[PDB]
Symmetry: D2
Subunit: 294 residues, 4 copies
Amino acid sequence: SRKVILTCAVTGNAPFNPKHPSMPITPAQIADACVEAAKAGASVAHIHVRDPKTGGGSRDPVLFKEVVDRVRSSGTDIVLNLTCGLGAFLLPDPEDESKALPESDVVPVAERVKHLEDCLPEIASLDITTGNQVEGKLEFVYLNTTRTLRAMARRFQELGIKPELEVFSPGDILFGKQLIEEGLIDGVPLFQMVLGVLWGAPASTETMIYQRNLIPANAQWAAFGIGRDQMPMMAQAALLGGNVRVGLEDNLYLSRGVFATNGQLVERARTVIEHLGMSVATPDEARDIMGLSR
Amino acid sequence: SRKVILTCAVTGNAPFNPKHPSMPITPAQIADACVEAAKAGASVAHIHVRDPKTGGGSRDPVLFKEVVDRVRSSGTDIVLNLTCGLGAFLLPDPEDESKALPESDVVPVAERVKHLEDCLPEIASLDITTGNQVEGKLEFVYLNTTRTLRAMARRFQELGIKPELEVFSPGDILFGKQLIEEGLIDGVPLFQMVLGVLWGAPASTETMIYQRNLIPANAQWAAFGIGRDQMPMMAQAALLGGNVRVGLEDNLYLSRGVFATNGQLVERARTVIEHLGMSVATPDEARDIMGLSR
Amino acid sequence: SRKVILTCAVTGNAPFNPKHPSMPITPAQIADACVEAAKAGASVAHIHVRDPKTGGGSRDPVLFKEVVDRVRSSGTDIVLNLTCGLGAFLLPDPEDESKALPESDVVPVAERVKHLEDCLPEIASLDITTGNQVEGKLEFVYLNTTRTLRAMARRFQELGIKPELEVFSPGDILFGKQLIEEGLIDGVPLFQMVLGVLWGAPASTETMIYQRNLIPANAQWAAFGIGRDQMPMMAQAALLGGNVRVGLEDNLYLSRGVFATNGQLVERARTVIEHLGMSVATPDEARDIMGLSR
Amino acid sequence: SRKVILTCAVTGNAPFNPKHPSMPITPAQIADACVEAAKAGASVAHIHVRDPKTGGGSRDPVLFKEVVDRVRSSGTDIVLNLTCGLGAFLLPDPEDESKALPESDVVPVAERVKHLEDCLPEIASLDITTGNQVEGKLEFVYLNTTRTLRAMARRFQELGIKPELEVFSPGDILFGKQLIEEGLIDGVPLFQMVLGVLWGAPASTETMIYQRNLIPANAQWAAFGIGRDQMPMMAQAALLGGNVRVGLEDNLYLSRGVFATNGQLVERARTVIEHLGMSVATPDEARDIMGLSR
Ligand code: NI
Ligand code: NI
Ligand code: NI
Ligand code: NI
């Protein structure tokens, strides 16, 4: 019985759908969601913050600090994974694509890592890719130069934070391996396949097997899907020796037309994993697997 | 005996290595190389132009026109495939990555397609990707927004030119399929996998099989590799029902320490294809396969 | 939400382990187990009979008839799948392997199909293979000549019984396809991969994907595993578009050191399928999928 | 540049087609064919003998001895691989399949290995399978019990002969691995996939990749095909890190309607291997790769 690491991505930064009656928006709600996920058996909480007003995207370090302070004082333990995918948002000017439209948010390393400096989570997410992306109807470019990624990786090492290397393609996996080569990735490397995001690798078993075989043998890997692909990709990862992820960041629905809580999503995934003869890693078990000190 | 389409990529725009004693630099040399490839059995010639002085990169429409005029008046027929990968070259300013360094060459659609308007080749190459790339020691970003790609595709349709959709990932293949969906790709779609370029999909059999299975059934596909992977990837594509590509654009060497001509590379590939029980499409046969009018 | 056909293999003919306190031995117990499986949501019951005394192997048509009569009069409906793997049991004489030891049970078609004639189930299992096999510590040869298989297939057609073509290798799948070619397989063909039996194809995702791709597009397929592989292979089949099988024939344990009932195994599989966004076919739904008349 | 081991299977025991004007029939012709293959660059010769009259199947040890004596005294070196697939030929009596028809040739270990005792080749072929087989229009059963295979393996060890473990399925590969487990396979294990024989694994890239991944990492492996699949499977094996096989045993034709010599087949394969950037192992190089003493 392998112990499967389960991460709950509690809110994300995709647009708030106010028909969802319990979407975590405020830092208190987001912390509450981490605790709820923990109590349902989650190993790790993946955390974004939202504009506490509008439910819109935010990268305010003050908000991150409040979330971490709340979870840490909750009386419930869970490994914290803070998003660091922020500040890579490029909108080329159609009149001259050499130029970034003002709504772009492409910011330097020092600013990108400010929240990490303040909060010191065990893990932070790093999207090790540049590419054409889509969020809903919104088309943009994710701009993470290998130069910037190298600098980020180095900062994480310095801060004692383990990156979760988020990959959208085999090419991305190769670059992750290059980071490792270059001495920029400490201990047990962590890779996660983002599946079914446009214009990245699709959510299929074939994709998962192919990409898995490119990942270093000494690394831990995970894979996840979005919406209706969330549960299938979770089971498929478990079956292939990977770790897993669920949460409202990736899927709002328990079933067709029925909104989920984070806890419910965790409970469902846990049930599947157990029924398949495995179990879900406690936070401390996950730390041990990942070589994180207790 | 399937007829395999063989494209010879005669020069490219990678830096000129002057130890190579017959590198095609001038339009006359480049045309001569197309003819040499044709005579050796190539179906298609993939053409770049170089600064006739320096052997450096160029996208001068005047040079393209001279090459096409020369090949067309040579007395030898071959399908022409002009590069249109040009003008997507982004070098983010390290001091502010929202800004493009002056050495960047990111130009509008109308300028990108000028040479195509003048030369009217049967085929032109379109790199349907945005990503972190490497050429030698040089790291940069290829910036081809889906917006720009849609506009390009439309221009090709208008001009009666078939795009060769160059893909570096499964995600890229998905976007190609989206173009088809959107009515932006006429007739028989053409896909080609670029393998072993950093930070794209690697040159492996597994990569080729996986990506092939994402390509539409009604499409023609090719795959190629670079350097020592050129001949292996050619054979592997032939074996899997794909078309093939060789040439000095991709590999300078016939063998270890021995420089090749384009003709020699074509001859080698042709020999392999024939020995495997297949044959190399004549230009007219390739036109028929691709649904190009004669 | 695909409707997944779930077959419960209620007892089998592997040696009775009397530590299992509810193993179905008598025809009444075996019928009871079919009904229990149905009530838990099973689409189909796969039935063997046992020597009602000893719990040993049997192919007594009288026992088969009692089971079918009981299930059919139970007030609960389920599609019946009777084993017809019987009478192919060869034990070569070590002193002269051209000769069959007396303990062998290799019998003619007419005798093999007697129970089918009497019971007229909708489905019967046909092991379309000859090979070296292992049951526990017992090594033997399964002897099903293509000649015999052709004759069997023909008898099933005549009797209006759909064969479930049990396959242990890709070669076996090819022969199934040959049967179809030869007009010996009516309507929707049914294939099932037996995984992890020695010396057949192993229980891996890779095996399942590879073999699946050899199965005709118009066919229904299933895959199952033994013991600790039962639940993983069930989930993996569901994920890949196949149908599934559980039951005490294949696995005695709910968990480590804890014996299962057939109902419990069905319930577990059903829960997984539902959690993955699918559902389990009712008997009538399964009939419709398989093109069996109601 | 990997050194690829190339075996030439010079005649086999498939029915003599007398339209082939140079088919090796007599021991002198068969030896001559081994020498011809060697001179063209073959590493190994795979040898059967034929009834010197009729060109029909034979396992006469006297004939084997003459062939080996001739090759060894030829002045040309090549590794010898004698068939030991003989004596496993079962034709079940249709009137009672428990009984072997008189035309069957199922013989004991001691007789099966007589030629090996006399000739002491470096290698001998062992078909580690029982199954339904087809040769032309002839359907039969290959009967090699795991008991017999274990005894054979042991005899080879005693005689200092390396078995080439011939596999038709993944199940067969598993049993090969069991032999290794049991201490019945010395040094470097040798596996070869027989592809496209009915009713075994087909000649596809997918088959080769799948089966390759089941083979132990420390083992040498080969794969071959029949007829029109001979050259494709050779190239595909070379590309995947396997060794290769050609010869008149497997294919009579150089091209459509044109008969080949063994030398021509070797020359063609060698040319392909070299063009792909590899080379063909000399006999001594092949010995070194296989851990055979010189
Ligand atoms: Ni996130
Ligand atoms: Ni180019
Ligand atoms: Ni059964
Ligand atoms: Ni042979």
